[PDB]
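User: Is it possible to get a 3D structure for a protein together with its bound compound? The compound here is magnesium ion. I've pasted both below.
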Amino acid sequence: SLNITGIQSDWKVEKIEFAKLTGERARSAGANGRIGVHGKSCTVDIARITIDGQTGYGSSIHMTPEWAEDVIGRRLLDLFDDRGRLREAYRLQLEYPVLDWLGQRQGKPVYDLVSGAHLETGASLVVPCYDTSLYFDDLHLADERAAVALMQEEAMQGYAKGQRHFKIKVGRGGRHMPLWEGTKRDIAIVRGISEVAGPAGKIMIDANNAYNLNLTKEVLAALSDVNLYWLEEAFHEDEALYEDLKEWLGQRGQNVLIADGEGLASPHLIEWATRGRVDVLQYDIIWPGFTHWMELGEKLDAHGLRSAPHCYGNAYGIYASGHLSAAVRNFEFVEYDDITIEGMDVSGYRIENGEIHVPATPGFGIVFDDELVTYLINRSGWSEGHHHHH
Ligand SMILES: [Mg+2]
Ligand SMILES: [Mg+2]
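Assistant: Yes, that's possible. Here is the predicted structure of the complex:
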């Protein structure tokens, strides 16, 4: 919900411009339990919106020139319902540029504009984050010791940049290595990173569905001494298997959360979570997006459930996730990948002690290079403009 009382009926969408920004991860990402090398190259589709002679910038997906043509001339007020929530039809395309615009216009950070009761006025926003970049980077190595040292040094690269919590890909034995050896390698890797991370470092493991229940129990038992904070997508979500898993964990006093929800999720996943089978929901920060997450976060909060938006493959979402924490009480972590996108200055954000310090600057606090984005729009993007209707 957004305070819309300051939005004049005068204010209309005057222009929508679109461009793909390009860049690179700090370290090339290898395989995961289900698919191959993710690589080093990164892109972010951005829209620059002009309303009342002022621009906002943000992630935009599922928007064609034709789609934007129909929106030119609409009143900003008409894009919201009276609750202050951007209408469904505009979310994936325009929520981010619009929220960025409102922030620049009101001179406030988005988190301030969507702040829930759990977050009081004037306060610095500091959000937990974890390093998500620990992919299967060891598949060229035969020697388990060598694989562990490689993965440890990778974790160390993040540690030196202020990461304290690490999500480690596992499920090597599902597709990419023989099952027995792959699972042994998974365990050695996780034990190795936990050592580098220290006792206070939270460790998450993500199998990308490569396990079954008995493999999951074997791996958890081997990691009973590890500060394992959550297990994510051990196998495609299933209420019976997750009930058994939770009972098994309880009897052993092993305090590991169950996380799921990315990709093609079960339509019943939220029901299953309310029954205590899944603890952390992980729908993506871009699709279904920020506005949807505000609505979903409220609901999950009411049930004592936890929110951890998936972010991978879109650098912009990392910064978006930060702001969302102000609106959702049981926000867990920003999923962090070290990415440099040309023309997208994220300098205002700093990583310290396993947390991302969100700047108090207008909008999403990301400073876009107006000159470069104009060049990109002209060269490889598009513009739609004019005035109102129809
Ligand atoms: Mg995952
Ligand atoms: Mg799943």
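The pocket of magnesium ion (ligand 1) is lined by residues 206, 232-233, 262 (CB under 6 Å). The CA atoms of residues 209 and 236 lie 5 Å apart.
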